[PDB]
Design an enzyme around this catalytic site. Structure first.
Site, PDB file in Angstrom:
ATOM      1  N   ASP A   1       0.837  -1.179   0.000  1.00  7.89           N
ATOM      2  CA  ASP A   1       0.000   0.000   0.000  1.00  7.89           C
ATOM      3  C   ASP A   1       0.887   1.250   0.000  1.00  7.89           C
ATOM      4  O   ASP A   1       1.824   1.334  -0.778  1.00  7.89           O
ATOM      5  CB  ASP A   1      -0.958  -0.022   1.200  1.00  7.89           C
ATOM      6  CG  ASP A   1      -2.067   0.998   1.091  1.00  7.89           C
ATOM      7  OD1 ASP A   1      -2.736   1.077   0.043  1.00  7.89           O
ATOM      8  OD2 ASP A   1      -2.258   1.726   2.070  1.00  7.89           O
TER       9      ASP A   1
ATOM     10  N   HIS B   1      -7.748  -6.188  -0.731  1.00  7.42           N
ATOM     11  CA  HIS B   1      -6.704  -5.245  -0.327  1.00  7.42           C
ATOM     12  C   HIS B   1      -5.652  -5.707   0.690  1.00  7.42           C
ATOM     13  O   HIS B   1      -4.461  -5.538   0.448  1.00  7.42           O
ATOM     14  CB  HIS B   1      -7.345  -3.993   0.241  1.00  7.42           C
ATOM     15  CG  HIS B   1      -6.363  -2.910   0.533  1.00  7.42           C
ATOM     16  ND1 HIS B   1      -5.714  -2.195  -0.460  1.00  7.42           N
ATOM     17  CD2 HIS B   1      -5.883  -2.421   1.698  1.00  7.42           C
ATOM     18  CE1 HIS B   1      -4.901  -1.323   0.085  1.00  7.42           C
ATOM     19  NE2 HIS B   1      -4.987  -1.433   1.400  1.00  7.42           N
TER      20      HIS B   1
HETATM   21  O1  LIG Z   1      -5.205   4.581  -0.468  1.00  9.46           O
HETATM   22  C1  LIG Z   1      -4.603   3.532  -0.542  1.00  9.46           C
HETATM   23  N1  LIG Z   1      -3.422   3.451  -1.281  1.00  9.46           N
HETATM   24  C2  LIG Z   1      -2.928   4.581  -1.946  1.00  9.46           C
HETATM   25  C3  LIG Z   1      -1.677   5.057  -1.610  1.00  9.46           C
HETATM   26  C4  LIG Z   1      -1.172   6.153  -2.270  1.00  9.46           C
HETATM   27  C5  LIG Z   1      -1.913   6.770  -3.258  1.00  9.46           C
HETATM   28  C6  LIG Z   1      -3.164   6.278  -3.585  1.00  9.46           C
HETATM   29  C7  LIG Z   1      -3.684   5.171  -2.932  1.00  9.46           C
HETATM   30  N2  LIG Z   1      -5.019   2.357   0.108  1.00  9.46           N
HETATM   31  C8  LIG Z   1      -6.194   2.307   0.881  1.00  9.46           C
HETATM   32  C9  LIG Z   1      -6.226   1.458   1.971  1.00  9.46           C
HETATM   33  C10 LIG Z   1      -7.397   1.408   2.714  1.00  9.46           C
HETATM   34  C11 LIG Z   1      -8.478   2.184   2.353  1.00  9.46           C
HETATM   35  C12 LIG Z   1      -8.423   3.009   1.260  1.00  9.46           C
HETATM   36  C13 LIG Z   1      -7.279   3.068   0.518  1.00  9.46           C
END
Ligand SMILES: O=C(Nc1ccccc1)Nc1ccccc1
Length: 319
Positions: A101, A295
């Site tokens: 992530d 995820h």
């Molecule tokens: O947002 C998330 N990743 C990310 C990291 C950098 C830029 C864009 C996206 N993951 C996430 C994890 C849990 C809930 C929602 C998103």
């Protein structure tokens, strides 16, 4: 017997979890949002048994680590150098950097920013993406406009998502872990305009996920009840700044041995597509999509993610 120690790095102090024997080739684990060094609990003994020195910090803004009130303190250059100072701490010239992530983004940027230090890089969930022509917040409003709901845009204004997520840390963690889905009934309802929050928009699962016990979940809730969520949120508040900071790597490439690995059902691959990952990762590269995984991949499919990490790492020059 994974240990923890406080480590001074890059002008801050991180809570470090590590296991194995110093001198053994070094593998660094960088969690994501809203997670901890706890999220690598199933990985660490595997990697140790595989003959590695493992390091898993609570990254800046999380857990037992420094949480600067300043947002600019959370930009990409800050977070990468944070990790490189771990290598420094023990004399390490280079290491393997694994990230899930936001961690994955951090390690991807690390490959490009400290190519000398990075012997191999793995990113979970979030793929290598070429630098956009427009700043991400522009890109994202292009994508979804200004009336629909989109979380990363919802996280920008300081305070607002913070209150929401802090308000009920249990609801947050349980809907985060159990509620993240690429289901189209849900997506539609997450996007729809109106005042409701992100956690509000999220479904609330009846029973715990099969991969997560009560104790584990309680741990997350505890730590984020103590710290709050501002620290990680301030990572998202730096996307545009991180875009400015990195103009000078638009032709730069990762020649290091790469691995990308995601649950095929991860919602973030809709706007974090992995099609152009070989545009950035030009050395050895490998994509691993896990069928029916979403995820929280390292936690859901631990033996699988272990086996891919370990096999990725076997045979490489990391020292
Ligand atoms: O947002 C998330 N990743 C990310 C990291 C950098 C830029 C864009 C996206 N993951 C996430 C994890 C849990 C809930 C929602 C998103």
């Amino acid at each position: 017997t994974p240990s923890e120690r406080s480590v001074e790095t890059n002008g801050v102090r991180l809570r470090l979890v590590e296991a194995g024997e110093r001198g053994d080739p070094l593998v660094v684990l960088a969690h994501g949002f809203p997670e901890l060094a706890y999220s690598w609990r199933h990985q660490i003994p595997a990697l140790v048994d595989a003959g590695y020195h493992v390091m898993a910090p609570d990254q800046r803004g999380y857990g037992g680590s420094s949480a600067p009130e300043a947002i600019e303190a959370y930009d990409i250059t800050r977070l990468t150098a944070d990790l490189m100072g771990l290598l420094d701490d023990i004399g390490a010239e280079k290491a393997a950097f694994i990230g899930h992530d936001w961690g994955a983004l951090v390690v991807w940027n690390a490959a490009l920013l400290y190519p000398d230090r990075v012997a191999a890089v793995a990113g979970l969930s979030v793929p290598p993406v070429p630098r956009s022509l427009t700043r991400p917040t522009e890109a994202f409003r292009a994508l979804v406009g200004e009336d629909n709901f989109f979380y990363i845009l919802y996280f920008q204004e300081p305070g607002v998502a913070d209150a929401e997520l802090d308000g009920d840390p249990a609801r947050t963690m349980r809907r985060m872990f159990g509620g993240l889905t690429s289901d189209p009934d849900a997506a539609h309802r997450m996007l729809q305009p109106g005042p409701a929050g992100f956690i509000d928009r999220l479904p609330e699962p009846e029973a715990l996920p099969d991969w997560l016990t009560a104790e584990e979940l309680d741990h997350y809730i505890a730590e984020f009840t103590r710290t709050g969520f501002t620290g990680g949120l301030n990572w998202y508040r730096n996307m545009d700044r991180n875009w400015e900071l990195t103009e000078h790597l638009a032709g730069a490439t990762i020649t290091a041995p790469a691995l990308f690995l995601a649950g095929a059902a991860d919602p973030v691959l809709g706007f974090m597509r992995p099609e152009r990952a070989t545009e950035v990762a030009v050395g050895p590269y490998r994509q691993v999509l896990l069928d029916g995984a979403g995820h929280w991949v390292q936690q859901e499919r631990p033996q699988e993610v272990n086996a891919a990490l370990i096999d990725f790492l076997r045979g490489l020059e990391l020292q």
